[PDB]
Amino acid sequence: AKDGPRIIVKMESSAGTGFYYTTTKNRRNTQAKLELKKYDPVAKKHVVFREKK
Amino acid sequence: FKRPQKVQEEAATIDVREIDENVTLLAADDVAEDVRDVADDADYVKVLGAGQVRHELTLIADDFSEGAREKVEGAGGSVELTDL
Amino acid sequence: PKMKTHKMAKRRIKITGTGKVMAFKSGKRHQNTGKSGDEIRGKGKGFVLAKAEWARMKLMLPR
Amino acid sequence: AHKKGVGSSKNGRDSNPKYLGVKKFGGEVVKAGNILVRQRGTKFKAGQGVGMGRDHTLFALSDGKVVFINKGKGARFISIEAAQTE
RNA sequence: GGACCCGGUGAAAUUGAACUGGCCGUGAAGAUGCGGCCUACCCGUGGCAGGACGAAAAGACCCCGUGGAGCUUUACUGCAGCCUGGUGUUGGCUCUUGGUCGCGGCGCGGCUGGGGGCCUAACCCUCGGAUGGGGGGACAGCGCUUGGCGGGCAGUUUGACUGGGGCGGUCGCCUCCUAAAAGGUAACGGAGGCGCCCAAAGGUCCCCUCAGGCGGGACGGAAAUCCGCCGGAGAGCGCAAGGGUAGAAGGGGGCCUGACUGCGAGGCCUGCAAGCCGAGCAGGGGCGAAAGCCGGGCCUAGUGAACCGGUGGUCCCGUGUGGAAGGGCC
RNA sequence: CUUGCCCGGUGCCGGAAGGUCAAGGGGAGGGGUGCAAGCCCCGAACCGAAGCCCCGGUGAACGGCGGCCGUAACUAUAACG
RNA sequence: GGGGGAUGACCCCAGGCGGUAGGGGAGCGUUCCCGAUGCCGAUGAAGGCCGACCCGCGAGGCGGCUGGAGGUAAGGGAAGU
RNA sequence: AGGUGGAGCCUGGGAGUGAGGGCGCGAGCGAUAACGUCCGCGUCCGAGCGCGGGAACAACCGAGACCGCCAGCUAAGGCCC
RNA sequence: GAGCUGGGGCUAGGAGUGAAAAGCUAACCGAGCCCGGAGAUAGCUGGUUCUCCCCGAAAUGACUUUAGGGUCAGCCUCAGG
RNA sequence: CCGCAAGGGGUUGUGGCGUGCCUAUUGAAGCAUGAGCCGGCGACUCACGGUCGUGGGCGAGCUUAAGCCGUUGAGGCGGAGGCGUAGGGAAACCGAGUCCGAACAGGGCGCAAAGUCCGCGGCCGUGGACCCGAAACCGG
RNA sequence: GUGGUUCGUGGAGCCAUGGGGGAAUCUGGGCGGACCACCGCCUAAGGCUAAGUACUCCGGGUGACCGAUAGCGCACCAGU
RNA sequence: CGGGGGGAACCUGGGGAACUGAAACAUCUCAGUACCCAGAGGAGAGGAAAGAGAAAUCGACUCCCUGAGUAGCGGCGAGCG
């Protein structure tokens, strides 16, 4: 998107490998290297999910 | 989505009822115990299901759909081209 | 003699015996769009009427 | 390379609110009453409003849809006599 | 000296046509021809300029055609020429320092880089009286690629709005008012906001009852902090307005992330594309005992076609078959 | 008769030690097919040109060459500040 | 449009009918190619000159005068109308 | 519901203008100024919505022009010349 | 006298010449003239033909280097259901 | 004056009602332009495509180029092809079913209604292509 | 570094060449589109070659081709 | 002994462009066209394959139809094809 080194930075998150990812917008603003949550890659379902990229 | 040149392969459109019928007029040849392979309308024999196999006949061609080949078994045979 | 924006003929295009023609959804995606998900579920195919006349025609013949 | 002031001059753009389907017509599982999208429809007609009483829409199917406060979200069912045994 | 009367000769632009008066009114708003009226016989020649919007010329001043042509510079690009590295017909002899890998070091080693020298057989030039000498000489001329300057020139371009062109403004999108009460409409008509953001204003489960005013006491004399009364919520909600609306969206705490994939019956607005809504169906969770809610936010702004490409996934294509460059799909 | 003041930008003249950077040399390393010797590319650390950056000189080279408040001034800049 | 049309036509009434861009239907003469078991004319081809029969019409026919040689197609076709 | 009667709906070929004004009214601007412009509701004209009227005057009041010269009632508007 | 001149010639028309205004280059060179691209393009301008029948337009809205163009809609017309 | 006689010819004295004609125009008599007068030239055409409508030959319909036959010269053979015979999909491929997907929720289609060649037309593209109109660029 | 090719710098080959390196003579040497294995094709870096298609100054034939402002502009002391 | 000079049109080589389309215009198009040059002929062009493609299939060159407005080239736009 409109890449603006302004606390506005786009990122994703793997599925422990579940394989690929899924969309997400972000803001250093707070918690830098902070970013985790679960989902479900083509890999079965669910799976921890770090976001960092 | 198109290519950087040519290439390509092949195959055609030949189907059920289609035959049985217009092939009913195909009886002017191998339309007895029927060794199909016209020679009249199309290019690269394929067999479409729909309809209801019949005229009990073995067909020297490429292939066909599910049912078709099935129905086929209804009352006939099925031979494939070159090597299969 | 004749041809056709062969183009559009390429991208978005191609008719059904019905005498009608269609090309892939075409909301946003495939450019900018961190946007959302469900929105994703927003790319199948879109059939615009009227104009699809220039189209079809201009293509006419092979497609 | 900028813009000026003391020229207020600032036209406004377009909307498109309505009551679509108004009150008491052939009811179709589709956009009920509108004046606040993202809306959260309801059940049958609506009668709650910054006015007092209520409104029936002698039209019944799945559901309709609200407008956020205005009108008055549905809930006071009202399938309509035209919802009995065929 | 023409002009005027005679005799001889004898054109020329413009012109629909016409026997063409003044008035005061009128019409597209400066009329012999339309209305009312007043003067009004038919023709002519010598004249005098006012009107026939007289003649000349499809305004040169104007704007409009994403017309043209000339000059300009820190407009765009490109060429001419000029500078420039390596390379070639541009051959010898010696003086030298640098790198490097191997066996701060030094010894060696292949490697290879810089450079200084008369020469000299190309090359060129030189001539000066012949083809030999002379001068320079590895130059350079000059060929090929590099790069650079480069308006000298060559070709295009330099928006729209605009109650005259320009200067001035202004173009998107959110709200009010304008819209006469369905919807919806100009105005360079009014006023005001936006190209953010919030990982926790997210999802639920559990609790709360506002501003304010009055009365009573610490640090306090506007303006807290607590205690006791009054309250169609006038506070409250990140941001502009407007609707909302405590029952609450609104104030806390508990765990929780669906701020989901596959989809969506069926509608709103709509020439286009968009834009926007949504039960319910399946897989898989979260919150609650559960009946249920969860597919981000209270909303309506926080925006962009399609192509031109990157990258993580596919293992669909793979141009004799085995593959990969490369391509399609996510 | 007399041409004064400014080289911060610009053109230019000089400098070339240092940054940069083209073609290029020159090797780490990866890649495809390869039974294997091989056989094609991507290749980068460093060396590497003018130019540009940076130092200076440059005006009968382009070009430019301040503002307001106070003060003897019975009144006005001004001699000063 | 509708009431019976024998091919015409005839009767009712409904029912209008002003119209530029522009849309649909129907007709007219112009020079040619048929000669769909077609040919006129020296007592005039045709054009011309003039007219109080035929048609809504664009045209027809037909009669009088002129003038030296042509060409007409009852029907369909074509186009430098 | 429908007295109506003749508009309606879908598919499809062929289009034109893509900038108008004038009047009444309700609003905007504007000196509530203009034969000013700007949006709306109806009409109006459209180079023929050709004729009557208001002298004359598209245009405002009445009127819908298939055709019939020596018929008849009226509209609006008029009737001393 | 950078004097006027005849005769002989040289240069040339994106190029010449020019004691230099864009002057002069076979009587209008801001880039000659003839033939050729070629009947260049030309939202602009005109011009745009025989009769007759039938109905009957818009001068708004949406996007445009688009505003005196034109796309799509809206209003026309004919064929069938 | 009555070669179409009791009806008309021609000319007008009066009176009666009357703004020419073309383009572009909100609107025009025009004082906006167009034209002095007459005669002849002079402007929506042809080709290949495609596109609907219609006249008709077979429904699988239809013909290139050529070979032969040709007062008139007489057409007749030629079966590469191309449109319909399912389509759905980027594709693999499947197939009256298919793609998304792991789900029976929708998109395209099935359902024959079947064309096809030709003729003649209203049009659409390439064409100088409704007709003339300029300033300019480029070659010799 | 250009060409032609449908290829407009592209995953981009073949053939043709502007500059510089400068192989092989039959297990040789290009080729079948980057490349590589294997298969399959072909044998260059000299030359000649009628016939099948194009064009009308010329001569003929034929015309739903013209008729003196149409046809070539010019039907006859016209490119004068 | 041969040449050279011609010659409407046609042929290959040598060299070789803007308009205009893309509704600008730098890529692109018109095109390898128009023009100029040289030269062969009555015809030149070309012509027994280090060719084509892939069914182990085809074979001189040329030209007509077809392949095909397909495979495909591209500010994937106008077009070229």
Q: Which residues contact C44 (CB under 8 A, 6 or more apart)?
A: C24, C25
Q: Is residue D24 part of a domain?
A: yes
Q: Is residue D61 part of a domain?
A: yes
Q: Is residue D10 part of a domain?
A: no
Instruction: Using an 8 Å CB-CB cutoff, list chain B residues near C11.
Output: 1
Instruction: Using an 8 Å CB-CB cutoff, list chain B residues near C10.
Output: 1-2
Cα separation, B48 vs B63, in Å, equals: 9
Find where tokens 């009249």 sit.
B40
**Spacing of A27 CA from L7 C1' in Å:** 87
Q: CA B46, B50, B52 angle in degrees (round to 5)?
A: 100
Q: Is residue D64 part of a domain?
A: yes
Chains C and A touch, using 3 or more CB pairs below 8 Å: yes
CATH number at residue B20: 3.100.10.10
What was the structure determination method?
X-ray
**What is the total count of domains within chain B?**
1
SS (H, E, C) A4-32: CEECEEECCCCCCCCCCCCCCEECCCCCC
Q: Is residue D72 part of a domain?
A: yes
Q: Is residue D63 part of a domain?
A: yes
Q: If you write DSSP's letter for every residue of C10-61 in order, what string do you get?
A: SSS--EETTTEE-EE--SS-SSS--S-STTSS--SEE---SSTTHHHHHH-T
Kind of pairing between the strands at A9-10 and A25-26: antiparallel
**What is the total count of domains within chain D?**
1
Cα separation, B17 vs B12, in Å, equals: 16
Pairwise CB contact (< 8 Å): A23 & C32: no
Cα separation, B24 vs B18, in Å, equals: 9
Nearest to C36 among A1, A10, A23 (CB): A23
Task: Return the structure tokens found at C25.
Answer: 């959804």
Q: If you write DSSP's letter for every residue of chain B in order, what string do you get?
A: ---SS----------TTTIIIIIGGGGGSS-SS------SS-SS-EE--SS---S----EESEE-HHHHHHHHHS---EESS--
Instruction: Using an 8 Å CB-CB cutoff, list chain C residues near A25.
Output: 34
Q: Which domain holds residue B6?
A: 1-84
Q: Is residue D8 part of a domain?
A: no
Q: Around Cβ C16, how many Cβ atoms within 10 Å?
A: 9
Smallest CA–C1' separation from B66, nucleotide: J95
> What 3-state class would DSSP assign to A35?
coil
Q: Which domain holds residue D60?
A: 20-84
CATH number at residue D37: 2.40.50.100
